[PDB]
Paper text:
Fcho1 and Fcho2 likely play a key role in local AP-2 restructuring, as they are among the earliest proteins to mark a nascent CCS (Henne et al., 2010, Taylor et al., 2011) and affect AP-2 conformation directly (Hollopeter et al., 2014, Umasankar et al., 2014). But what makes Fchos unusual is that the C-terminal SH3 domain typical of most EFC-domain proteins is replaced by a μ-homology domain (μHD), distantly related in primary sequence to cargo-selective μ subunits of the heterotetrameric clathrin adaptors such as AP-2 (Reider et al., 2009). The μHD of all three (designated the muniscins) binds directly to the pioneer protein Eps15 (Henne et al., 2010, Reider et al., 2009, Uezu et al., 2007, Umasankar et al., 2012). The structure of an Eps15/R⋅Fcho1 μ-homology domain complex reveals a spacing-dependent DPF triad, bound in a mechanistically distinct way from the mode of single DPF binding to AP-2.
A fusion of EPS15 (designated ET615-EG637) to the zebrafish Fcho1 μHD (residues 867–1,152) with a GAGA spacer crystallized and diffracted to 2.4 Å. In the final structure, excellent-quality electron density is visible for residues EF620-EG637 of EPS15 and P874-L1152 of the μHD. There is no evidence of the spacer residues separating the EPS15 and μHD sections, but distance constraints make it highly likely that the interaction is intramolecular. Like other μ subunits, the Fcho1 μHD contains 18 β strands arranged as two intercalated β-sandwich subdomains, the fold being comparable with the orthologous Saccharomyces cerevisiae Syp1p μHD (Reider et al., 2009) and μ1–μ4. Yet the Fcho1 μHD also contains three additional α helices in subdomain A, and the concave face of the Fcho1 μHD is considerably more curved than other μHDs. The EPS15 segment binds in a spiral trough that runs halfway around the long axis of subdomain A, with the Fcho μHD-unique α helices forming a considerable part of the trough. The trough is lined with conserved largely hydrophobic residues, and significant contacts with the protein are only through the three DPF motif side chains of the sequence 623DPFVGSDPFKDDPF; the interaction buries 1,640 Å2 of solvent-accessible area. The electron density indicates well-ordered DPFs; the first two adopt type I tight turn conformations stabilized by intramolecular H bonding between the Asp residue side chains and the backbone amide of the +2-position Phe residues. In the last DPF, the side chain of ED634 additionally forms a salt bridge with R1133. Thus the structure strongly suggests that the short tri- (VGS) or di- (KD) residue spacing between tandem DPFs is important to allow three to simultaneously dock onto a single Fcho1 subdomain A with a 1:1 stoichiometry.
Residue numbers in the entry:
A (entry chain E): 620 to 637
B (entry chain A): 877 to 1100, 1104 to 1151
The structure:
């Protein structure tokens, strides 16, 4: 349980944005 | 074109739970949950924000918050309505100028990152009702002469627990290195660094009786304080313990994801 809740795993990696 | 498309953000709800089951006659308990709400922004949304100081207002709502005792919003970045009396819901608006500056600094600080996290809220929930604890513990202790016996019943309950598994489940009973004639059902390891008995438990689920409940015990002899206490550790994902949730208000932004995780802090069963 590190301070980055997304644990270095980009939550937007698969998002169609951009 | 980036200007007109709906922009994604992501939220993370993190909760720690401390609990104490006193044991004895009534086995009364105390529960304290401490939570954190973080929001994540995609790196490319800075260039949008810096370029447009008039960028539309990111707004969100907390829901199912009746179980939360206290809130500490981030007052650097957020607005709210003190005249909003709704007990189960509360609204917050971002200050888009402060938010823009905040992400600009985050980017400047870490140009390599593909996202930037922002801390929205801290909160707390306390109860003496065991119904708030996902895992019910009852410990008992008996001593005849030099022999001490300790037993623990655990119950993962549908009335108590969120809908998800408890994983990385461990049960810790501290025991000194002077103890002899060790018996454990089921078997346990003795960690010499910390001086404690370790049980590793299978994942627990409220869905099934056989999957969710159990018992364990240990006994030893000591040639020679208070009754020993057992500590339980576990982790979960996909639900919150408090019940709190977050949803966006308005269609201009959309929530890419909401990550929910919880873990035990000090989570204890004492025996009389
Ligand atoms: Zn039950």
């Amino acid at each position: 349980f590190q301070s980055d809740p997304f644990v270095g795993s980009d939550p937007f990696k698969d998002d169609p944005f951009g | 074109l980036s200007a007109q498309e709906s922009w994604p953000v992501a939220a993370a709800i993190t909760e720690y739970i401390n609990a104490y089951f006193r044991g004895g006659e009534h086995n009364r308990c105390l529960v304290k949950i401490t939570g954190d709400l973080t929001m994540s922004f995609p790196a490319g949304i800075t260039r949008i924000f810096t370029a447009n100081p008039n960028a539309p207002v990111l707004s969100f709502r907390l829901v199912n918050i009746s179980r939360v005792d206290h809130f500490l919003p981030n007052q650097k970045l957020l607005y709210s309505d003190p005249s909003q009396s709704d007990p189960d819901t509360k609204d917050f608006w971002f200050n888009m100028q402060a938010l823009t500056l905040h992400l600009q600094r985050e980017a400047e600080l870490n140009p390599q990152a593909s996202y930037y996290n922002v801390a929205l809220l801290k909160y707390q929930a306390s109860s003496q009702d065991p119904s708030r604890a996902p895992l019910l513990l009852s410990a008992e202790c008996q001593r005849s002469g030099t022999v001490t016996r300790v037993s623990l019943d655990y119950h993962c309950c549908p009335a108590t627990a969120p809908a998800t598994q408890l994983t990385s489940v461990q049960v810790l009973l501290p025991l000194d290195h002077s103890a002899t004639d060790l018996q454990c059902q089921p078997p346990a390891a003795w960690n010499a660094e910390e001086r404690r008995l370790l049980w590793k438990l299978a994942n627990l689920s409220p869905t099934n009786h056989s999957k969710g409940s159990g018992t364990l015990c240990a006994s030893w002899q000591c040639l020679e304080g208070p009754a020993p206490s057992l500590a339980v550790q576990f982790v979960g994902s996909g639900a919150s313990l408090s019940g709190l949730d977050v949803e966006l208000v308005g269609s201009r932004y959309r929530m890419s994801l909401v990550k929910k995780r919880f873990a035990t802090g000090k989570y204890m069963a004492g025996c009389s």
